[PDB]
Amino acid sequence: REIVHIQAGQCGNQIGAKFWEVISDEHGIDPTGSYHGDSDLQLERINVYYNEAAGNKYVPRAILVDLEPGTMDSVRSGPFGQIFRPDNFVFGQSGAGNNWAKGHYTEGAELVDSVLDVVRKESESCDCLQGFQLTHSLGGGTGSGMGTLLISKIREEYPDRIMNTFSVVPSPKVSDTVVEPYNATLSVHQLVENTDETYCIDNEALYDICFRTLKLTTPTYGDLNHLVSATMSGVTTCLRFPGQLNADLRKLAVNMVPFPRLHFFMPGFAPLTSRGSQQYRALTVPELTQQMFDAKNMMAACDPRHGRYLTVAAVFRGRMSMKEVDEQMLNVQNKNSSYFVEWIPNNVKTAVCDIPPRGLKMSATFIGNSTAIQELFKRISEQFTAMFRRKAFLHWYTGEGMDEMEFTEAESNMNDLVSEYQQYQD
Amino acid sequence: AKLSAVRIAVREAPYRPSVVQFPPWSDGKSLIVDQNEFHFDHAFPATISQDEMYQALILPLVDKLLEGFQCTALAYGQTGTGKSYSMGMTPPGEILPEHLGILPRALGDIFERVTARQENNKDAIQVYASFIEIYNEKPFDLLGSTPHMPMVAARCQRCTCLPLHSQADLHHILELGTRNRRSRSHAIVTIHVKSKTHHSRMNIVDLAGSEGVVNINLGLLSINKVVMSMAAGHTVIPYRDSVLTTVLQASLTAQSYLTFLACISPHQCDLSETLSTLRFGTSAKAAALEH
Amino acid sequence: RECISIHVGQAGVQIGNACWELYCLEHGIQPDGHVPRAVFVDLEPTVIDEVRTGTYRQLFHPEQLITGKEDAANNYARGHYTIGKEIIDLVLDRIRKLADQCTGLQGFSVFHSFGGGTGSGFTSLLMERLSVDYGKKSKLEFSIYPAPQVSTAVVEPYNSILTTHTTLEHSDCAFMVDNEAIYDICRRNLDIERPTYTNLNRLIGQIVSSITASLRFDGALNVDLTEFQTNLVPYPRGHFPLATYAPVISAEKAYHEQLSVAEITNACFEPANQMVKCDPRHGKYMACCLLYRGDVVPKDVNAAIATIKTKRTIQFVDWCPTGFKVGINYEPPTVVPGGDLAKVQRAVCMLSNTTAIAEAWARLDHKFDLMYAKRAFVHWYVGEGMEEGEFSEAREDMAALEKDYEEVGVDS
């Protein structure tokens, strides 16, 4: 099987560097080097993310889409930056304006064809394609607009292969941009109707989880990114490993989406202990479920405790008892019968790889489909209206060839999306 | 919320030994095919006339439409089983009276009731028709200037509605749409009832052949998912699962009406296609629960 | 004389590798000896690959190892219809190519995992295409039906109410081994909270060895495969008996091993030892096939059983005077060199049809409804060449399996 990553925008891009920083080491691939793999198993399934050309050069099969040179020229001028074949860099030296409209209708719409071109060169690579990984932020141009287009096109070209989306939904407390809800509401819209698996991460849900669950005092972006990339590795790549009970994107999809919206999840990693001290090793297993299922530790902003779950997928990856795994999951399902929805006898989807995260003994990625994420699109949707009402920075959109009915559309859509999700919380 | 009513009817096409059996003792809503027993809301043998079928299945929806509820009547099934014939997709002018289908009959009763209530009228009512075609999961406006151009983010509402004042006008839109019409092609002719404060639709859907040889079927299919999602209140409806459910999104809402018309062949050679069509009816029948 | 076997689904393949292991182990045929007599099917390469990479690597022909690099999908539909279809031909070909090479066979021991994609769906049509190509044989399918509370897949029931209805009208005798109810045995009758799947497999890998292996093997009271279905199914429904083993004692902890027949047989009817969460909560047995192996005196049995026949609290069906097929083999069991199985010199792999499953099916059917009641993951099948029909019409199916398993019992 296979997949083809997609680094839309700067963020989605910045993260690319971290997702690939990791993944590679979790596959023994040095900058341009080959497979130094401490083992021999980190190779029989690599294909999922690379391509064979030389014999020591397995190049990441991702796409780097962005209308701001400097960015990709920071990712390509640093560490692992020199492993991507230049063909991968689909830049847009234009003005990468922070407008969803500027990267979806006017500026991005041009650079698109020169992207799809490659997304096809990579898809028609070899063997059988599974789906595409998509990273980006719903709070900017090259991210929400142009990346949200990249998919609307992808999903027309292969409505068969899957589409996981890793979105950095606009954090609450403080917005790292101003129109944010504009660029956001507009991209979520596109998401709820193309990709079929979305993993929403919040820069501040991370800080928290990174400053209190990792006594880490100076959580640089690199970190946040790093933590995130840690989860997306547990998801995909991982399951493309052996296991007593293994799954793969689809299983994950076909066990997690009760209703076609596409629904968004909230990823959570397992061993998340501070370096030295904490290295408690309390990782027998009840310790991992202890972790994963708590409020804090959910990369999302919202707290599960604020709304039932529809599905859950503990994708563990480290030798354990299909008994102490299958078992724990249960008590968990009974101690919290309250929030776990009922019309699904077994919400949880236990998954079990074998080999764990390179240096760790036992981990377990968590992919939750809780109704709690209602209380986020609400947020976003609110911010919109409060500012849409006055058409705040709307001239930067319309003036870019947009529509007063376009914004209406998205909000509503994504706004209805909130509605539905409640239809199950009850 | 839930739809006001989801109904399923089956109509046996004319025989050219029928595989379709109507039990000597039954409620008139049952049939047996290949030893399988099927139960719906209406089971019409090949002898049922257009008038009877319309009166039993569609006429009741006319009042609902006038009251402001969205209505959809959809024909599905194997090619050559009478879908177009039943829905009345052929221009009325070139059709004998007794063979006139659902579209012309419905429009007739709509005008009559509108003219009878235009004096104890609150507001004025105007009638229109739109003709949309879905070719390979792509919406096309057959009454616009670009009938061969795909639609996007607007096929749901933004599409030409031509005025209707008499059967002649219906004949025009059907003839016009048919000419501008181009391996599956679904047709959706909608009779729009518009007032200053209300807009109700009567969607007459004529799907392409369901026979085989995303997956040809998928609309209706997608339709069942929508019906279920609404019942269980998934607080996200899979409208975008298909172009069909996207175009009919405004009509697939609470206290809307949905009526399925399964057309089946009485021929042994079509047994497999017939069974597929009837099994789908049973599924839609179960999804209609809680409504 | 023989009995081919088709291990379908990752699980049916893991269990397969296991049952297949125990085999050579008690037949003195190391890694590289003769030639198996089965096949391996899966729509996820990486798993069958485990049989291509791991142990018992060269004991198979890359011909009896079928794979569909494509996608597994934990959904019946896709595995049965859409995808699973493409492979079937090829699959069959082997069970027609392997079925020919032999000499007057008896049937195909099928190994699948009820609630899976490749295991539920696929087989559904595999067994399906068999019942027609060899109606004149035995179709005993050995299943691992859905843990009563510890299921895995979110949809599981969808996949198991569908593998039951499609296979029902095609199997001869369906053996059942409950994944969870086996854990209990690993906790309560062996002590270990560290049971790897690789263990449950060693277990069924045992109970199964008692079925084919040893039975098709000479003895003082041989029992052919046909024998089963005959002495085991009272009615055409591909009736599902339950597998049970007796000396499930730990090869470390306790040691009373020397547990004469009189004991090991009583240890079969206590509900805490039956590889199935179908505790005889009321289910009246209606036929049991006590397969013994090792040093056993026929009188010991034709007495140990007599004592049972008169315990009454073990209530057998009415319409059944005597329902005890005593199968005696010679060669004692053969435990893994150093797993965790005791290693006695006699065992009792008793299987049976019990009005008990009236439960297990019930509890699994109900599940289904809850979700179907909301269509839950329905769009996943529809979009895979299925319809409201197949579900609703396979639900009605089992319905008459809840009435069937009710009527054939509880009444006189």
Ligand SMILES: CC(=O)O[C@H]1C(=O)[C@@]2(C)[C@H]([C@H](OC(=O)c3ccccc3)[C@]3(O)C[C@H](OC(=O)[C@H](O)[C@@H](NC(=O)c4ccccc4)c4ccccc4)C(C)=C1C3(C)C)[C@]1(OC(C)=O)CO[C@@H]1C[C@@H]2O
């Ligand atoms: C001596 C020793 O055992 O060191 C550990 C360690 O101290 C701890 C604290 C690690 C450490 O992780 C962090 O401090 C961290 C920093 C930024 C963001 C997130 C986490 C570690 O850096 C991370 C590193 O993780 C791995 O090696 C995994 O394979 C992981 N790899 C990466 O994230 C990675 C990092 C740099 C370069 C390339 C990859 C992984 C996880 C999931 C999927 C794929 C890969 C491990 C075990 C450790 C150190 C090295 C200190 C922990 O994290 C992980 C992801 O394992 C933090 O809590 C856990 C518990 C570990 O015990």
Ligand SMILES: Nc1nc2c(ncn2[C@@H]2O[C@H](COP(=O)(O)OP(=O)(O)OP(=O)(O)O)[C@@H](O)[C@H]2O)c(=O)[nH]1
């Ligand atoms: N006893 C036993 N049960 C197993 C084993 N592997 C899986 N199972 C059980 O069988 C079911 C899992 O089926 P899956 O592995 O998801 O799927 P599959 O049937 O192989 O086919 P796909 O869904 O297409 O992958 C669960 O109920 C597991 O508890 C095993 O090795 N032994």
Ligand SMILES: Nc1nc2c(ncn2[C@@H]2O[C@H](COP(=O)(O)OP(=O)(O)O)[C@@H](O)[C@H]2O)c(=O)[nH]1
């Ligand atoms: N986790 C994370 N968030 C980022 C990174 N870079 C920008 N962001 C977030 O992305 C949003 C800004 O969008 P940006 O990526 O600049 O848009 P674009 O570059 O025009 O497509 C803010 O909410 C930031 O917190 C990053 O490297 N990691």
Ligand SMILES: Nc1ncnc2c1ncn2[C@@H]1O[C@H](COP(=O)(O)OP(=O)(O)O)[C@@H](O)[C@H]1O
């Ligand atoms: N109930 C009927 N009475 C008389 N003729 C019919 C009947 N149903 C079908 N026909 C005729 O059969 C042919 C095919 O009907 P049609 O509706 O075009 O099948 P479909 O649209 O399903 O492919 C047309 O001549 C139609 O007039």
Ligand SMILES: [Mg+2]
């Ligand atoms: Mg037609």
Ligand SMILES: [Mg+2]
């Ligand atoms: Mg599998």
Ligand SMILES: [Zn+2]
């Ligand atoms: Zn002793």
